[PDB]
Design a protein around this ligand. Structure first.
Ligand code: PCD
Ligand code: FES
Ligand code: FES
Ligand SMILES: [Cl-]
Ligand SMILES: [Cl-]
Ligand SMILES: [Cl-]
Ligand SMILES: [Mg+2]
Ligand SMILES: [Mg+2]
Length: 907
């Protein structure tokens, strides 16, 4: 041990540390400075950036021996605090740079180090600095961060007043449609929002820390578990196995389709009979610390009989393949799409046909915050789970039978969380922590490291796809055929639903009267499928949007013009035979057309013989909702101090549940003149908030927004005085009148798609957009640079522009990664941020352009649609179409790795 006297955030600290300790652990655990966030633990993400003697360093790779006696350290807590924000923190809030917030301390400290060395940086200087310091963001697309740094610099420089960093009310008081900051932003930019790992550090002594004993093979029969040596290790309390589970020890997919061949109870909580994928949790070590639990977990001995693993859909779907789930075929679900007339003869006589085979792979979500959860037995005897769930009621019902509890005996709560992008539509760690809390009676806390986040949370399911079009010479589409194979890994939850998405979205955007297609879901031993932002559309529309450009190429038509010819117009129907609710694609195409022409001209002009520039187009469509007559509920309550609490279970991945609630409620409450700061939101809790539904399917602004609107209208009626005016709280209470008022809303016009034909009206609100990608391909290295992205977006009406801008930038950035670099195919090679192709700032162009072309939706609140998944529906098709424009070659199987682009160039 060594004594080190240093200064931290301006205050002398008398530190007693191990020389080998990591500064991240010392600051977080010894000094309680949980604003130093830890994500990757490998020096790759910058979340733990601190200033050490004038240099920005990552604390997670900085050992205490490198910290000199007398050193100066600055963490986010020393940059500023909630009622003393630094200009960078104020700019962050104004510019909406904290979405999930997990990266915000690291970027803001890093940016102070920049400004302390370069007072007046160029935007390029800012991007170069965040690239060298590895400041990673998965939510924002970086542009808002760079905007915030530039604004703060100008203030620090005396160029502009600091008060220009404070939001100015539009004067009229409307915050719907405005840039009003989100309520959680100040906590995020000051590091005072506790995420699950932070809460772990602030739990009482007595809390047990868990570590997973995981399969190190992809497929096996389990013969036995030997915990003997592990029990003798430092700090170890016990080891939990399937023997300790009090229910079925299985998670249910809950809405498994009747024509699924599987019963949806395939996924174990703790493996008992078999290993189904690498990473499967077979036991939990309970210990006094994460480090002690992990050291003992390595000593638990699992005796396995390894089985041949099927690591792709085609392998597992082979007619011969052995059943992964004995008794159930590996191909366990099929969804036909049957619209119009038989396609065979239409293909036979059409002027032009085109066909392609496409692939979109196992994209990893890569939130900066790895999965974390905790559980405890409440004084009331219920088991409480606090996790990254974005569907607390959904997960309650998916895990209660397996852990052996009735829905009245378990409570799920969503912690503040650092991003999920869909992976948390699945249970990950919740059943694990509940079993351990139940078995021990003690609080338990489980943190995944980043390798566990990559290998042992769910993934975008790969799809192998064949799509064909038939068309007339004038480009009018006549018919489509489609085939898709969905590799869902071993656990069936929502796999059949994802396969149905291919019937709804392959070919979406155009009138296509005649369709014949079939999707197939296959169990494999690769990572199980969890939703990933877009859920079926990134696969489906990559195929159809690339194919539209192949059809345009073949007809000698401009691809944008071919889309204009076919885009939805009154009278048309979508692939499931439903009429669109608004018709904005021609309008967006018309407004994009000159920008596209200018872009084509720039490309042609600025291409060189080795750096070829190109421009590519795509359309995106996705539903806002769960299929069918989805619904939500909210409660609007006048409190005794005159504030109003809007109670919902709107789960916040980081997309903006707080501002969606406040902005929607503010607009609904305008007749009573309620200031936005007087409106309170509730964190999701299955015991004390209503079943608003999960934050999946870009649904909450529509479904929960409408329920908030109705609850608020109902609260206005409850408060109205006859003759005009409103009663106060005190008045209603003296009157014995109610002050907490319910509202509900249902998408009553929707119907489920048919199991035999795929036809129906699954959503009553859709999102529509048009993408333009501008790229440069180095034809010596095959490296693609995305130089600009444009999204024409119809979101109906914006609840909050900071929120929708940031949603679109973040989605476009994930589309650049899906297009060029991201996959989870090799269990080892892809288990880090950099190995899996995470996009750092220089991979995302500063030019991210949005044009809103908003057609108010008949059934959305104040006309709004969702936004969440629109930007990831097909940006990667626009990018691959731009590589084809630049170079003449087509990448059919993502990602477009440089070697793959070179092989196509040289073919
Ligand atoms: N018009 C409009 C729309 C919308 N908004 C906004 O925006 C957001 C979003 O919304 P939406 O769309 O409704 O959505 P939500 O439901 O809430 O959420 C969900 C999503 O969200 C997104 N985004 C995001 N972001 C962030 N930051 N993070 C994350 O993680 C995430 N995730 C992702 C996903 S994947 Mo799935 O599950 O796959 O289906 S689906 C999803 C919010 O805040 C709201 O409010 C506005 O403002 N306006
Ligand atoms: S760089 Fe330190 S936690 Fe990622
Ligand atoms: S706000 Fe940057 S990772 Fe979420
Ligand atoms: Cl998906
Ligand atoms: Cl290819
Ligand atoms: Cl490569
Ligand atoms: Mg027509
Ligand atoms: Mg090669």
């Amino acid at each position: 041990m060594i004594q080190k006297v240093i200064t931290v955030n301006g205050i002398e600290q008398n530190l007693f540390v191990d020389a080998e300790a990591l500064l991240s652990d010392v600051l977080r655990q010894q000094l309680g400075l949980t604003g130093v966030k830890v994500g990757c633990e490998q020096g790759q993400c910058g979340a733990c950036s601190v200033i050490l003697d004038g240099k920005v360093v990552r604390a997670c790779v900085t050992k205490m021996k490198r910290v000199a006696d007398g050193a100066q350290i600055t963490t986010i807590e020393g940059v500023g605090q909630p009622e003393n924000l630094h200009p960078l923190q104020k700019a962050w809030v104004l510019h909406g740079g904290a979405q999930c917030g997990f990266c915000s301390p690291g970027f803001i400290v890093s940016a102070k180090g920049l400004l302390d060395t370069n007072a007046d940086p160029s935007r390029e200087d800012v991007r170069d600095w965040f690239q060298k310091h590895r400041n990673a963001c998965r939510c924002t697309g970086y542009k808002p961060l760079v905007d915030a740094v530039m604004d703060a610099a100008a203030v620090i420089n005396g160029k502009k007043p600091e008060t220009d960093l404070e939001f100015k009310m539009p004067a009229d008081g409307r915050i719907w449609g405005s840039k009003y900051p989100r309520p959680t932003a100040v906590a995020k930019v000051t590091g005072t929002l506790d995420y699950g790992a932070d809460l772990g550090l602030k739990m009482p002594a007595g809390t047990l820390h868990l570590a997973m004993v995981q399969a190190k093979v992809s497929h096996a029969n389990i013969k036995g578990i030997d915990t003997s040596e592990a029990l003798t290790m430092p700090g170890v309390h016990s080891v939990i196995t399937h023997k300790d589970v009090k229910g079925k020890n299985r998670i249910t997919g809950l809405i498994t389709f009747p024509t699924n061949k599987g019963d949806g109870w395939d996924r174990p909580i703790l493996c008992d009979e078999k290993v189904f994928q690498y990473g499967d949790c077979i036991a939990l070590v309970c210990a006094d610390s994460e480090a002690n639990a992990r050291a003992a977990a390595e000593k638990v001995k699992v005796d396995l009989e390894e089985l041949p693993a099927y690591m792709s859909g085609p392998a597992a779907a082979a007619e011969d393949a052995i059943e992964i789930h004995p008794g159930t075929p590996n191909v366990y679900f099929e969804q036909p799409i049957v619209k119009g007339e038989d396609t065979g003869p239409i293909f036979a006589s059409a002027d032009v046909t085109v066909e392609g085979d496409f692939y979109v792979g196992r994209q990893p979500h890569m939130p900066i915050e790895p999965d974390v959860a905790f559980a405890y037995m409440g004084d009331d005897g219920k088991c409480y789970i606090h996790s990254k769930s974005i569907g607390v009621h959904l997960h309650l019902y998916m895990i209660a039978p397996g852990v052996g509890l009735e829905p009245d005996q378990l409570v799920l709560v969503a912690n503040p969380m650092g991003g999920t992008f869909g992976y948390k539509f699945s249970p990950t760690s919740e059943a694990l922590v509940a079993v351990a809390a139940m078995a021990t009676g003690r609080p338990v806390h489980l943190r995944y490291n980043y390798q566990q986040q990559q290998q042992y949370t769910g993934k975008r399911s790969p799809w192998e796809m064949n799509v064909k079009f038939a068309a007339k010479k004038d480009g009018t589409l006549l018919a489509m055929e489609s085939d898709w194979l969905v590799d869902h890994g071993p656990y069936s939850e929502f796999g059949d639903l994802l396969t149905l998405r291919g019937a709804q979205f392959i070919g979406a955007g155009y009138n296509i009267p005649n369709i014949r297609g079939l999707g197939r879901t296959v169990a494999t031993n690769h990572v199980w499928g969890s939703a990933f932002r877009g859920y079926g559309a990134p696969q489906s529309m990559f195929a159809s949007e690339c194919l539209m450009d192949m059809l345009a190429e073949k007809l000698g038509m401009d691809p944008l013009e071919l889309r204009y010819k076919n885009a939805y117009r009154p009278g048309d129907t979508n692939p499931t035979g439903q009429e669109p609710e608004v018709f904005s694609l021609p309008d967006m195409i018309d407004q994009l057309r000159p920008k596209y022409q200018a872009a084509l001209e720039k490309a042609q002009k600025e291409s060189t013989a080795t750096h070829k520039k190109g421009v590519g187009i795509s359309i995106g469509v996705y539903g806002s909702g769960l299929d069918g007559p989805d619904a939500s509920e909210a409660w609007a309550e006048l409190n005794a101090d005159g504030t109003i609490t809007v109670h919902t279970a709107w789960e916040d991945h980081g997309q903006g549940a707080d501002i969606g609630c406040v902005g929607t409620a503010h607009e609904a409450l305008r007749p009573m003149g309620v200031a936005p700061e007087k409106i309170k939101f509730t964190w999701p809790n299955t015991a004390t908030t209503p079943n608003s539904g999960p934050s999946g399917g870009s649904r909450q602004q529509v479904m929960t927004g409408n329920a908030i609107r109705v609850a608020c209208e109902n609260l206005l009626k409850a408060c109205e005085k006859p003759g005009g005016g409103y009663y106060t709280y005190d008045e209603l209470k003296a009157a014995d009148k109610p002050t907490k008022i319910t509202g509900n809303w249902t998408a009553s016009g929707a119907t489920h798609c048919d199991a035999v034909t795929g036809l129906g009206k699954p959503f009553v609100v859709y999102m529509y957009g048009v993408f333009m990608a501008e790229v440069t391909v180095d034809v010596a290295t095959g490296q693609t640079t995305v130089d600009g992205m444009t999204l024409m977006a119809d979101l109906g009406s914006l609840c909050n522009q900071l929120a929708t801008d940031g949603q679109i930038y973040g989605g476009l950035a994930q589309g650049i990664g899906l297009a060029l670099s991201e996959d989870f195919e090799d269990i080892k090679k892809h288990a880090t941020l950099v190995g899996a192709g995470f996009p750092f700032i220089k991979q995302i162009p500063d030019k991210l352009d949005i044009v809103y072309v908003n057609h108010p939706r008949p059934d959305g609140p104040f006309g709004a649609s969702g936004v969440g998944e629109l930007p990831l529906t097909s940006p990667h098709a626009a990018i691959i179409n731009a590589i084809k424009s630049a170079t003449g070659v087509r990448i059919y199987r993502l990602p477009a790795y440089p070697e793959k682009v070179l092989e196509a160039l040289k073919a």
